[PDB]
């Protein structure tokens, strides 16, 4: 349910729901990026 | 939970003879189930019967008739007789009263044993013994024995 | 009629109710706060505790060891019993037991005192207190110290002792821990009962256990003898806890309401303390430290394990192992799983589905929480350095918590988090006192506070109220808050230890049954009401009276 | 001043347990079951006796379900959510777990296969279970202001309960199904000296030797390399067979597997695991060591390990039907084809109910002043009625279905006695001294004081 996006301009942690427009809540920039996943990221060092 | 076979095509309803011997009248919106064409049924002589097999009725309320197998159940068999005029020849008889005439999928795992030990992957496909693990670090998907996998 | 008070502890009472022709003991409470004055029992001979400097009195140096300015007795931790000599315990007929915390010292009454009566308690109180007695006896008898120190329990010497040891009361009545055969003999004479079950005692009084809501199996008692009822309200909870909710309706129209087991440190929100516990645990294990949680194997540990289960996925602490080391740990978890009929409607709706009632069971199958009988067996092979350990006795005098504090107290990254309100936090830390460990005190007492008990007494309206003296006074930590006391329209009845209360609530009108042979022979003469003159022979059998026509 | 009892269900028959009791102006139905073997709409009891197009909530103050057997609980969703009943349905906690899954199984049987037109759906099964109030052992629950019922351990199945229905000084004890001999997973029936006005008991009718012979047969067949295919039809028989097998396999310490099938026996295993306090003394006492229903030898059968070769034990889902006939045909004419009904065929039967001597013992130990017989065969009821009226000298009754039976009772008036007069009567006479006093028969209460207290308070 709670989804976080990162604004492309001001780099703000943005809690928004679904079906509401992609709109930064304090600078109005309309491009946001997903945060890095919380799953296990393991690489061999080759 | 109940299957059936339609005996008559009507404009807004389906006339379906289920395992009752009674014809029901239901609306169009029934669902469809995949028929088990390779199912095995057993008669009173414990002989194997399958689809499109002629069987005789020797017990039940309608003993004496003869039918052909169309669909199968755990303890029931569907019968057809072209000389029988009720409900288009559809009928049902019990099987024993006749005679012949994974959770691992999508889970992140660690290979804890073997040459790929320490590799982290996601199970794409799995069986009782082996599992297809999509390795996070490489582009490979490898077959790993499930005794060498640890869910992380 | 009369009410003897064998214990001065508010949450660990032992009250003997001399009611009509039957003598009822309401709970038996072992005061384990007496153990705080003793030096802790370690699993291995720690260098720090062994060569502590002795304390000298100019009048004993081997008996007393001083650690960081506090003097500790170097004997086995002894337990303050209920006072067993005011009333002869062979004259009491029935012991009613409310909590498993209030079932300790039952081997002391049932064996050493000549008590030949019967004991009533619910299934989970008996089983869980059996587990707690087992781990207490085990903890005392793992590495047996001797009862060497005896001179300090003297009236001439204890006056001269410093304040933590001088203030100890009834020191001559303190006794060593009972053994396991005494536990078995004490628990063999318990008659098991269920909630809202009528128990007739010699045809005179009727006792039922009513659900209290504090712990699973914990029960309040009402004692009815015809047209008079005594309500015993022990430790009860009005919050959304796992056991069955408090039965407030059956306590109504009671002539005297004996209440005990209120909240220690009432100025604490238990939900806020759960939040503080989870936040401090996450902060410690995020820094690479270690969390030690001294707790009982049953009780609040289930609630905080539920909240930690809901918290680890949110905080991302799935890599932090949770260790539960106790000799009765596995039995405690299994007993919590199978006592679903004694839980609230939310928990026992889960077992209608094929599902465990407590969510901590899923932690074993996901291997998040690992439980061990002891440190030595296989915990020493499955130990990861950033971890959380629920272990030991909360008194910090015996159990595996002593070894863990001796191991982890030299580092400031490690923390100890206190959730049990039973023992004084400062006195618990006092024998370990030169420690760099951060100590977090967040007690999660979920019992009745004073606004809750004011609402309960307004709802029930008992004719008389009997409470300990500490509930009438403000707590000495506050000593000014007038809302932290019991206030009723009658100004209660306070008692101290070894005090006898006379209850003037005795009335006339004992009930009788008249057979229809006499009922026809009595003419209902008109008075306006009716009057009739009866001549019958009185038949009494099993304290029940009958009227027979001559 | 009468107790009227009308069994609308069983009477002098087996199955469809439904007994109406009208003690002291309050009407209680004692079971609500269905009659297996009938398909002509006589499965559900005739509720037209109580109300003909009337509200059953007003007529019935309480509905009691003894245990989860379909002849005692199968008609409950119909009776609630089709006829109309939103009152209290009192039931035992393990019964409330097993009853939805056995009702759904018979709903699966009757709606899919064998002729159910007027029946109940799964949604109204859940609706009926939503009205169920669960009770514990020996818990006196107050359904009304003066009517209270109390459950006693019956030991027939898991959570089978004997109910005492007490209102005022008059009490009726109904024992649905019970067994006075303990099983390997259940205890025996127990009742205190209630001395009720009426004991409604079942009347329809060595064990160690039978169990030893069954174990010897199983061991001899599995040590010869063959595989057994013992079927189970009831849940209690299945759990008893599994626990007796598991302790035998653990005692002999042989590792050839034992398997059980179906998605319903697994649910029964889980519910039996979750209800340890409703089991035998051994399971409760040795639970701290290990859960005996967490089987270390009996495992889930993935088509009986895909019917692999070798010696193994397989539990069939029915006692015929599917999931047993395939195994029976696949193993006919084999080395050891031992199939033990309740191609070598053995006969090992385990009694789930009480025999005649158990009923005699229950009547002797509860000690009622009248006995009523249901749930059995008419000849056996006549023989047991003769035994009751001969050996214990207490009235027995023979009601059929729909046949009311009324009983006269003598209530005792509760009167208060002034304590001074009572202590005076304790003083003199203890050394046939008469008690002379005045009965102030006021409104809604009775006091019996001395003449001095009568004149000073006149
Ligand atoms: Zn922005
Ligand atoms: Zn039955
Ligand atoms: Zn039965």
Swiss-Prot record, chain B:
Annotated ranges, domain KOW: 49-82, 103-136
Tissue: Ubiquitously expressed.
Post-translational modification (record): Methylated by PRMT1/HRMT1L2 and PRMT5/SKB1. Methylation negatively regulates interaction with P-TEFb and RNA polymerase II. Phosphorylated by CDK7 and CDK9. Phosphorylation by P-TEFb (CDK9) at Thr residues of the C-terminal repeats alleviates transcriptional pausing and promotes transcription elongation. Dephosphorylated by the INTAC complex when transcripts are unfavorably configured for transcriptional elongation, leading to premature transcription termination: dephosphorylation is mediated by the PPP2CA component of the INTAC complex. Dephosphorylated by the PNUTS-PP1 complex in termination zones downstream of poly(A) sites, thereby promoting deceleration of RNA polymerase II transcription.
UniProt effect for mutating residue 37 to E: Reduces the affinity for Pol II elongation complex
Residue numbers of N6-acetyllysine PTMs: 117
Covalent S-S links between cysteines: none
Compartments, record wording: Nucleus
Residues that coordinate or bind DNA: 74
Residues that coordinate or bind RNA: 34
Subunit note: Interacts with SUPT4H1 to form DSIF. DSIF interacts with the positive transcription elongation factor b complex (P-TEFb complex), which is composed of CDK9 and cyclin-T (CCNT1 or CCNT2). DSIF interacts with RNA polymerase II (Pol II); forms DNA and RNA clamps that stabilize Pol II elongation complex while maintaining the nontemplate DNA strand in the transcription bubble and nascent RNA in the exit channel. This interaction is reduced by phosphorylation of the C-terminal domain (CTD) of POLR2A by P-TEFb.
Record-stated family: Belongs to the SPT5 family.
Name of the protein: Transcription elongation factor SPT5
Gene name, Swiss-Prot/TrEMBL: SUPT5H
From Swiss-Prot, chain C:
Protein's UniProt keywords contain Flavoprotein: no
GO biological process, one term: snRNA processing
Annotated 1D-myo-inositol hexakisphosphate binding sites: 2, 19, 506-507
GO CC terms in record: cytoplasm; cytosol; INTAC complex; integrator complex; nucleoplasm; nucleus
Localization in the cell: Nucleus; Cytoplasm
UniProt keyword terms in alphabetical order: Cytoplasm, Isopeptide bond, Nucleus, Ubl conjugation
Position(s), cross-link Glycyl lysine isopeptide (Lys-Gly) (interchain with G-Cter in SUMO2): 58
Superkingdom: Eukaryota
Extra information: Although strongly related to RNA-specific endonuclease proteins, it lacks the HXHXDH motif that binds zinc and participates in the catalytic center. Its function as endonuclease is therefore unsure.
Quaternary assembly: Component of the Integrator complex, composed of core subunits INTS1, INTS2, INTS3, INTS4, INTS5, INTS6, INTS7, INTS8, INTS9/RC74, INTS10, INTS11/CPSF3L, INTS12, INTS13, INTS14 and INTS15. The core complex associates with protein phosphatase 2A subunits PPP2CA and PPP2R1A, to form the Integrator-PP2A (INTAC) complex. INTS9 is part of the RNA endonuclease subcomplex, composed of INTS4, INTS9, INTS11 and inositol hexakisphosphate (InsP6). Interacts with WDR73; interaction is required for the assembly of the RNA endonuclease subcomplex in the cytoplasm.
Purpose: Component of the integrator complex, a multiprotein complex that terminates RNA polymerase II (Pol II) transcription in the promoter-proximal region of genes.
Family: Belongs to the metallo-beta-lactamase superfamily. RNA-metabolizing metallo-beta-lactamase-like family. INTS9 subfamily.
This protein's name: Integrator complex subunit 9
Native organism: Homo sapiens (Human)
First-to-last residue of the parent protein present: 1 to 556 of 658
Swiss-Prot record, chain D:
Crosslinked positions (Glycyl lysine isopeptide (Lys-Gly) (interchain with G-Cter in SUMO)): 423
Enzyme Commission designation: 3.1.27.-
Listed result of changing residue 211 to G: In NEDMLOB; uncertain significance
Binding sites annotated in the UniProt record for Zn(2+) 1: 67, 69, 156, 177
Disease: Neurodevelopmental disorder with motor and language delay, ocular defects, and brain abnormalities: An autosomal recessive disorder apparent from infancy or early childhood, and characterized by global developmental delay, intellectual disability, motor and speech impairment, and brain abnormalities. Specifically, brain imaging shows progressive cortical atrophy, cortical gyral simplification, and delayed myelination affecting cerebrum and cerebellum. Ocular defects can include optic atrophy, nystagmus, strabismus, and retinal dystrophy.
Subunit structure, interactors included: Component of the Integrator complex, composed of core subunits INTS1, INTS2, INTS3, INTS4, INTS5, INTS6, INTS7, INTS8, INTS9/RC74, INTS10, INTS11/CPSF3L, INTS12, INTS13, INTS14 and INTS15. The core complex associates with protein phosphatase 2A subunits PPP2CA and PPP2R1A, to form the Integrator-PP2A (INTAC) complex. INTS11 is part of the RNA endonuclease subcomplex, composed of INTS4, INTS9, INTS11 and inositol hexakisphosphate (InsP6). Interacts with WDR73; interaction is required for the assembly of the RNA endonuclease subcomplex in the cytoplasm.
Protein name (Swiss-Prot/TrEMBL): Integrator complex subunit 11
Native source organism of the sequence: Homo sapiens (Human)
Taxonomic classification: Eukaryota, Metazoa, Chordata, Craniata, Vertebrata
Gene name of the record: INTS11
């Amino acid at each position: 349910q709670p989804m976080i996006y990162i604004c492309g301009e001001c780099h703000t942690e943005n809690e928004i729901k679904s079906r509401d427009p992609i709109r930064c809540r304090e600078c109005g920039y309309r491009i946001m990026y997903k945060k890095r996943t919380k799953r296990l990221v393991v690489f061999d060092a080759r | 939970q109940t299957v059936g076979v339609i005996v008559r095509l009507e404009r807004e309803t389906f006339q379906v003879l289920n395992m009752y011997g009674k014809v029901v009248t239901v609306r169009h919106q029934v669902t469809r189930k995949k028929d088990n064409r390779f199912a095995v049924a057993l008669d009173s002589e414990q002989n194997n019967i399958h689809v499109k097999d002629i069987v005789k009725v020797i017990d039940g309320p309608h003993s004496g008739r003869e039918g052909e197998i169309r669909h199968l159940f755990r303890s029931f068999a569907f019968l057809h007789c072209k000389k029988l005029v009720e409900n288009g020849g559809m009928f049902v008889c019990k099987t024993r009263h006749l005679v012949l005439a994974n959770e691992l999928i999508g889970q992140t795992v660690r290979i804890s044993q073997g040459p790929y030990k320490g590799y982290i992957g996601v199970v794409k496909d799995a069986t009782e013994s082996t599992a297809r693990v999509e390795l996070h670090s490489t582009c490979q998907t490898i077959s790993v024995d499930r005794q060498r996998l640890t869910t992380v | 009629m009369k009410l003897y008070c064998l214990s001065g502890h508010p949450t660990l009472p032992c009250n003997v109710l001399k009611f009509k022709s039957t003598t009822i003991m309401l709970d038996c409470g072992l005061d384990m706060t007496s153990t705080l004055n003793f030096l802790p029992l370690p699993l291995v001979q720690s260098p720090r505790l062994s060569n502590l400097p002795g304390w000298s009195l100019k009048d004993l140096d081997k008996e007393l060891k001083e650690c960081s300015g506090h003097v500790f007795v170097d004997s086995v931790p002894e337990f303050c019993l209920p006072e067993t000599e005011l009333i002869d315990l062979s004259t009491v007929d029935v012991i009613l037991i409310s909590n498993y915390h209030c079932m300790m010292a039952l081997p002391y009454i049932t064996e050493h005192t000549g008590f030949t009566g019967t004991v009533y308690a619910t299934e989970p109180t008996v089983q869980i207190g059996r587990l707690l007695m087992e781990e207490l006896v085990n903890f005392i008898e793992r590495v047996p110290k001797a009862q060497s120190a005896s001179l300090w329990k003297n009236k001439d010497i204890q006056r001269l002792l410093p304040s933590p040891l001088k203030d100890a009361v009834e020191v001559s009545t303190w006794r060593r821990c009972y053994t396991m055969q005494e536990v078995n003999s004490a628990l063999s004479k318990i008659q098991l009962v269920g909630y809202s079950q009528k128990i007739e005692l010699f045809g005179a009084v009727q006792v039922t256990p009513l659900s209290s809501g504090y712990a699973l199996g914990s029960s309040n008692w009402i004692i009815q003898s015809h047209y008079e009822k005594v309500s015993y309200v022990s430790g009860s909870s009005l919050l959304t806890t796992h056991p069955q909710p408090m039965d407030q309706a059956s306590l109504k129209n009671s002539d005297v309401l004996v209440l005990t087991g209120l909240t220690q440190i009432p100025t604490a929100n238990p939900d806020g303390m759960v939040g503080e516990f989870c936040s401090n645990l996450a902060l410690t294990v995020r820094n690479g430290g270690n969390v030690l949680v001294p707790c009982y194997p049953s009780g609040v540990i289930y609630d905080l394990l539920e909240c930690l289960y809901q918290y680890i996925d949110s905080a991302g602490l799935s890599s932090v192992p949770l260790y539960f080391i106790s000799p009765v740990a596995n039995s405690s978890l299994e007993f919590s799983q199978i006592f679903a009929e004694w839980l609230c409607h939310n928990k026992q709706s889960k077992v209608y589905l094929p599902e465990p009632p407590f969510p901590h069971a899923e932690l074993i199958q996901t291997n998040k929480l690992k439980h061990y009988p002891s440190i030595h067996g296989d915990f020493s092979n499955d130990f990861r350095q950033p971890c959380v350990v629920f272990t030991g006795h909360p008194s910090l005098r015996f159990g595996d918590v002593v070894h863990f504090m001796e191991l982890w107290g030299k580092s400031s990254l490690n923390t100890v988090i206190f959730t049990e309100p039973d023992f004084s936090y400062l006195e618990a830390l006092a024998p370990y006192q030169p420690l760099a460990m951060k100590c977090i005190y967040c007690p999660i007492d979920t019992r009745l506070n004073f606004i809750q008990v004011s609402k309960l007494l307004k709802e029930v309206q008992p004719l008389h109220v009997v409470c300990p003296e500490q509930y009438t006074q403000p707590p000495p930590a506050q000593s000014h808050r007038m809302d932290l006391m019991i206030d009723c329209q009658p100004p209660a009845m306070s008692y101290r230890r070894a005090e006898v209360l006379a209850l003037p609530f005795k009335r006339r009108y004992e009930k009788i049954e008249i057979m229809p042979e006499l009922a026809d022979s009595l003419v209902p003469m008109e008075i306006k009401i009716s009057l009739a003159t009866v001549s019958a022979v009185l038949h009494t059998k099993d304290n029940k009276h009958l009227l027979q026509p001559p | 001043p009468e107790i009227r009892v009308t069994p609308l269900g069983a009477g002098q028959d087996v199955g469809r347990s439904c007994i109406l009791v009208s003690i002291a102006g309050k009407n209680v139905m004692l079971d609500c079951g269905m009659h297996m073997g009938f398909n002509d709409d006589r499965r559900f009891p005739d509720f037209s006796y109580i109300t003909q197009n009337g509200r059953l909530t007003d007529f019935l103050d309480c509905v009691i379900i003894s245990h989860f057997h379909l002849d005692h609980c199968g008609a409950l969703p119909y009776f609630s959510e089709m006829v109309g009943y939103d009152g209290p349905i009192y039931m035992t906690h393990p019964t409330q777990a097993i009853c939805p899954i056995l009702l759904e199984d018979y709903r699966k049987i009757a709606v899919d296969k064998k002729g159910e037109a007027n029946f109940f759906t799964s949604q109204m099964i859940k609706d009926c279970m939503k009205k169920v109030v669960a009770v514990h052992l020996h818990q006196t629950v107050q359904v009304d202001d003066e009517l209270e019922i109390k459950a006693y351990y019956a030991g027939h199945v898991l959570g089978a309960a004997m109910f005492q229905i007490k209102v005022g000084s008059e009490s009726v004890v109904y024992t649905g199904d019970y067994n006075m001999t303990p099983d390997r997973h259940l205890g025996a029936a127990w009742i205190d000296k209630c001395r009720p006005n009426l004991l409604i008991t079942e009347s329809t009718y060595s064990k160690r030797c039978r169990e030893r012979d069954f174990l010897k047969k199983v061991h001899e067949t599995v040590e010869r390399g063959g595989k057994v295919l013992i079927p189970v039809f009831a849940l209690g028989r299945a759990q008893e067979l599994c626990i007796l097998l598991e302790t035998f396999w653990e005692r002999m310490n042989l590792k050839v597997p034992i398997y059980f099938s179906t998605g319903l026996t697994e649910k029964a295993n889980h519910y039996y695991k979750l209800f340890i306090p409703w089991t035998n003394q051994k399971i409760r006492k040795t639970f701290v060591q290990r859960n005996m229903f967490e089987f270390k030898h009996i495992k889930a059968f993935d088509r009986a390990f895909a019917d692999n070769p070798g010696p193994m034990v397989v539990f069939a889902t029915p006692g015929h039907a599917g999931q047993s006939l395939q195994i029976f045909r696949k193993w006919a004419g084999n080395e050891k084809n031992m199939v033990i009904m309740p191609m070598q065929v053995e006969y090992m039967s385990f009694s789930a109910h009480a025999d005649a001597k158990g009923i005699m013992q229950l009547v002797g130990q509860a000690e009622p002043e009248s006995v009523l017989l249901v749930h059995g065969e008419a000849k056996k009821m006549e023989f047991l009625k003769q035994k009751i009226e001969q050996e214990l000298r207490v009235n027995c009754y023979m009601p059929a279905n729909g046949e009311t039976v009324t009983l006269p009772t003598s209530p005792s008036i509760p009167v208060g006695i002034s304590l001074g007069l009572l202590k005076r009567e304790m003083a003199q006479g203890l050394l046939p001294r008469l008690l002379h006093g005045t009965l102030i028969m006021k409104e809604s209460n009775f006091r019996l004081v001395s003449s001095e207290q009568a004149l000073k308070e006149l």
